[PDB]
């Protein structure tokens, strides 16, 4: 680890450590996480991460450079990226991100997330703090997990999880999604649930208590309860009221109650709404 410099601890659980640091001979400004190395005919399970990152090499997902194996001790160097969307969503509070911004990042995280889901990977746990931005306008999928190896705020877990289901579909993530995205228009969490019930109640006060006819299967599932407070769906239009039409007819689709008929990230690509998609940079 003699060339990083400059190094600064960014993140920490109890599994990992991450850091920003500059290498002094090459120049270039990397992230460096540090994972500690236990005794090891079982694989070590820091390999599963390091997989993955290589399966998924893309230009919207976080980019590994370098493994250093130092001591009891493996660093995995990631290409720097400046900051989270969590933290660019608190800058631009004051003045809303610029829709074309918006239309660009959401573009983007559904590239990403498509070329994931043709490789049969579930993110599972979308989230502002999990996506990364740069200089340049570009947004890139990261899982900035450190509590674990590869193998809590519920605001983008889908109803089916919330309800029980034994299988995730890759019908999670478009969800998870779908709630960033509106949150990038309105400025505040769509459904920002404290507990599992309170969770699910938010996002059913929102779009209505979801019955057979919406969501066939609903009332069969583990945690369902006949017993569940009754909302009628609210005026979509006043759900995300700075959206036009093209805007809240893929936000209803990602939203859709039930995962068989929720869009899918490659259909959501070719969706009216980015017609006219371009590339801004942020202002940082
Ligand atoms: C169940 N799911 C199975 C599939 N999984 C894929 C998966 C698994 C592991 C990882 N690892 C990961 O981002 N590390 C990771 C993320 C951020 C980080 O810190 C950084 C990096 C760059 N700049 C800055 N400022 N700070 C360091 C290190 C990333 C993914 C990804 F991107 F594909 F989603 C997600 C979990
Ligand atoms: C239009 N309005 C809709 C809301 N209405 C009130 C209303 C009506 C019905 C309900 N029903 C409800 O929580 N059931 C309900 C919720 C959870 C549950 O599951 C549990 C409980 C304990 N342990 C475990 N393991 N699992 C069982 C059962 C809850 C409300 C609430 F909370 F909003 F006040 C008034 C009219």
Not at 51 to 77: A, G
Not at 116 to 142: F, M, W, Y
Not at 193 to 202: A, K, T, V, Y
């Amino acid at each position: 680890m003699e060339n990083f410099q400059k190094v600064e601890k960014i993140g920490e659980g109890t599994y990992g450590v991450v850091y920003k640091a500059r290498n002094k001979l090459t120049g270039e400004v990397v992230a460096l996480k540090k994972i500690r190395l236990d005794t090891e005919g079982v694989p070590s399970t820091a390999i599963r991460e390091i997989s993955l990152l290589k399966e998924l090499n893309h230009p919207n997902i976080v980019k590994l450079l370098d493994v250093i194996h130092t001591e009891n001790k493996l660093y995995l160097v990631f290409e720097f990226l400046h900051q989270d969307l969590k933290k660019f969503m608190d800058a631009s509070a004051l003045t809303g991100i610029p829709l074309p911004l918006i239309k660009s990042y959401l573009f983007q995280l559904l590239q990403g997330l498509a070329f994931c889901h043709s490789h049969r990977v579930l993110h599972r746990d979308l989230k502002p703090q999990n996506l990364l931005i740069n200089t340049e306008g570009a947004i890139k999928l990261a899982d900035f997990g450190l509590a674990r190896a590869f193998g809590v705020t519920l605001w983008y877990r889908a109803p089916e999880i919330l309800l029980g289901c034994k299988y995730y579909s890759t019908a999670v993530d478009i969800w998870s999604l779908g709630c960033i995205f509106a949150e990038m228009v309105t400025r505040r969490a769509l459904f920002p649930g404290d507990s599992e019930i309170d969770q699910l109640f938010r996002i059913f006060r929102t779009l209505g208590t979801p019955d057979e006819v919406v969501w066939p299967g609903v009332t069969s599932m583990p945690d369902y309860k006949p017993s569940f407070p009754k909302w009628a769906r609210q005026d979509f239009s006043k759900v995300v009221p700075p959206l036009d039409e093209d805007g809240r007819s893929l936000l209803s689709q990602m939203l859709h109650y039930d995962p068989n008929k929720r869009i899918s990230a490659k259909a959501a690509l070719a969706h009216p709404f980015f017609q006219d998609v371009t590339k801004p940079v942020p202002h940082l």
